[PDB]
Design a protein around this nucleic acid. Structure first.
Length: 667
RNA sequence: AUUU
């Protein structure tokens, strides 16, 4: 009933690239964007379901976003600033998602930036050579400052004194400077011996600093307290970030080894007293280092804390209980592949370019983002996935290095791996009946080099057969076989279609892959073939076959006549049954609606997905939410109006045809 | 230090 977005992962090793304002709104830098998430009653979630929603994106930087900071000035919580490896500092208005103004004053990679808690239009940024800019965005003024010739890691403007800024460097140096006196160093805080977070005591000073040296140091405007991180059982090097809660100044929250969060008790100074977050609940803690911690006080006054992590989860912590309220997962690579299980309805496998398979339990009642990760034996970009049609938990996958594997997602065992590799990327995986020389279902894998292998899913480490030998023998072929780029079995298991590099599609019949038809329609490499399902209103529809190539135009063919005549010599088809025009770039994926007769969705490099009434050649609905090139699409199993798509923007969107404003792709 |  509402959209969802699995977004790109929060950027790593950035001291402040996420922030939140009251009510409220969380933003996080991810790749070249900032993603915005409404949190609390304003998200409008059912009681029990986590009160967050992904609501927007700040689009316009051309390289990695390294910094993000909201304004914390009442009445302008809608303003925020970003830094980027594109060299710019931008001021944005999240109401319109547009740039207010920006500068390109830095000449070296920007490290971070901070919006002044005291001056309404002042943003202070710092770079890898040590240069600092003060930017008063709303009066067109700026000032460069240069304190020490060292790489800035972090910077925090005082909450109390408008001229005072603390800066932390790569080498462990910390300084408090006065920006009204050309950045004069007012205090040099000597103590740390490796990379510097800086949090000021929220009552009027003390500063706390967190370091790669595994210490938190609390200083006076001289050191007053050194806290070494504890070594705890597990359940990269350290990143040590801090949140000093403004309403509980005797508490200090830190990250720790492995992404554990601690609440330190500053009253019990000496004894290094802390309380571990999530200490009761099992497996809700982060599993890798935490980079940023952002407090968010909701309008119903719940105190929350958002964490970002190298584990690719964003977690929301309830400060009253220190338990995890909810988790938003994210993706660290292209979304190459989507596959829904026929056995466990709603179980959605996603093949991602960060080397981890995701299985999204899409129908989870109380969680819109119930995602589990599978990393064992994967280790490269997962470019193809296909669930077994009847065996629960059985997930085939393929990779950009030619590897084919079989997961049991109901176990914790590493997957079985095929001993035979493809030379190139595994494009497609499909189950179907075995064919000679193999002896219920075989696994078929098509690689970019053009071979389709038949694997025995019980003996994966055994022999896998190039099906071209059977095709050659059964059809008495003398010349070299086409370079196969796609495989798709008809739903009855009786006909295999191969799509080829030269654009042709070939139709083969069991048992021996006798060729019965060649379709010559596409003039470029075939990327996707899909056969219509068998549960529509007329049996004729199971003969419909949609296909897409590196050209924009989609075809449907109707293979009833040829299949039913079982010819002794093959037929050539050169006219389409239906033609679907509208896209403006290559077609990566086509899928038929299981809820309708003759309804198709297509994904394109044009950045859109299109829903078609294929039988009337009528475009119905065009989705434009992705920023990237779409690679995969799949209809939701229970909602006729809901479709999932994945793209090279590192996003998976779940979207509703009823909420989309266009009927056809951009011209 | 991942972001094709």
């Amino acid at each position: 009933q509402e959209p969802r977005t699995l977004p790109p992962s929060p950027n790593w090793y950035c001291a402040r690239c996420s922030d939140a304002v009251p009510g409220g709104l969380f933003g996080f830098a991810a790749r070249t964007s900032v993603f915005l998430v409404r949190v609390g009653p304003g998200a409008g979630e059912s009681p029990g379901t986590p009160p967050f929603r992904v609501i927007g994106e700040l689009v316009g930087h051309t390289e990695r976003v390294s910094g993000f900071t909201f304004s914390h000035h009442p009445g302008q919580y809608n303003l925020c600033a970003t830094s980027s490896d594109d060299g710019t500092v931008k001021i944005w208005d999240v109401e319109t998602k547009t740039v207010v103004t920006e500068h390109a004053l830095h000449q070296h990679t920007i490290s971070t930036l901070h919006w002044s808690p005291r001056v309404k239009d002042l943003i202070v940024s710092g770079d890898e050579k040590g240069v600092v800019f003060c930017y008063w965005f709303n009066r067109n003024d700026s000032q460069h400052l240069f304190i020490e010739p060292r790489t800035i890691f972090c910077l925090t403007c005082s909450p109390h004194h408008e001229d005072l800024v603390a800066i932390g460097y790569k080498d462990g140096i910390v300084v408090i400077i006065d920006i009204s006196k050309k950045g004069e160093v007012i205090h040099r805080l000597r103590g740390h011996d490796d990379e510097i977070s800086i949090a000021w005591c929220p009552l009027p000073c003390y500063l706390a600093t967190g370091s790669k040296d595994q210490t938190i140091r609390i200083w006076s405007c001289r050191g007053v307290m050194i806290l070494k991180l504890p070594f705890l059982k597990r359940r990269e090097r350290l990143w040590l970030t801090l949140h000093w809660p403004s309403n509980q100044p005797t508490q200090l929250v830190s990250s720790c080894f492995g992404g554990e969060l601690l609440q330190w008790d500053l009253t019990q100074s000496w004894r290094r007293k802390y309380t571990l977050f999530s200490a009761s609940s099992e497996g809700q803690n982060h599993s890798r280092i935490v980079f940023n911690l952002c407090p968010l006080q909701t309008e119903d006054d719940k105190q929350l804390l958002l964490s970002t992590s190298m584990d690719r989860d964003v977690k929301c912590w309830d400060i009253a209980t220190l338990e995890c309220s909810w988790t938003l997962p994210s993706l660290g690579g292209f979304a190459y592949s989507l596959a829904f299980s026929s056995v466990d309805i709603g179980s959605l496998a996603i093949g991602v370019g960060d080397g981890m398979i995701r299985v999204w339990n899409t129908l989870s009642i109380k969680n819109n983002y119930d995602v589990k990760n599978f990393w064992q034996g994967v280790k490269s970009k997962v470019t193809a996935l296909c669930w077994h049609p009847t065996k629960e938990g059985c997930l085939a996958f393929g990779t950009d290095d030619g590897k084919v594997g079989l997961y049991d997602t109901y176990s914790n065992k590493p997957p079985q791996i095929s001993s035979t590799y493809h030379k190139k990327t595994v494009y497609t995986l499909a189950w179907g009946p075995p064919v000679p020389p193999m002896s219920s279902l075989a696994l078929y894998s098509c690689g970019g080099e053009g071979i389709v292998l038949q694997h025995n899913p019980w003996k994966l480490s055994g022999e896998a057969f190039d099906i071209n030998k059977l095709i050659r023998d059964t059809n008495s072929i003398k010349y070299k076989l086409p370079v196969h780029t796609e495989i798709s079995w008809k739903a009855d298991g009786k006909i295999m279609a191969l799509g080829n590099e030269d654009g042709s599609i070939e139709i083969f019949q069991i048992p021996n892959l006798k060729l019965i038809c060649t379709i010559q329609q596409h003039h470029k490499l075939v990327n996707t073939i899909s056969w219509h399902h068998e549960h529509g209103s007329q049996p004729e529809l199971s003969y419909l076959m949609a296909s897409g190539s590196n050209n924009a135009v989609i075809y449907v063919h109707n293979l009833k006549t040829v299949i039913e005549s079982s010819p002794e010599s093959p037929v050539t088809i050169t006219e389409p049954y239906r033609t679907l025009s509208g896209h403006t770039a290559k077609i990566t994926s086509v899928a038929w609606s299981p809820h309708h007769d003759g309804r198709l969705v297509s994904a394109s490099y044009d950045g859109t997905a299109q829903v078609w009434d294929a039988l009337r050649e009528e475009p119905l609905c065009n989705f434009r939410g992705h920023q990237g090139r779409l690679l995969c699409v799949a209809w939701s199993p229970l909602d006729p109006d809901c479709i999932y798509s994945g793209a090279d923007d590192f996003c998976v969107h779940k979207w509703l045809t009823s909420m989309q404003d266009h009927s056809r792709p951009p011209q």
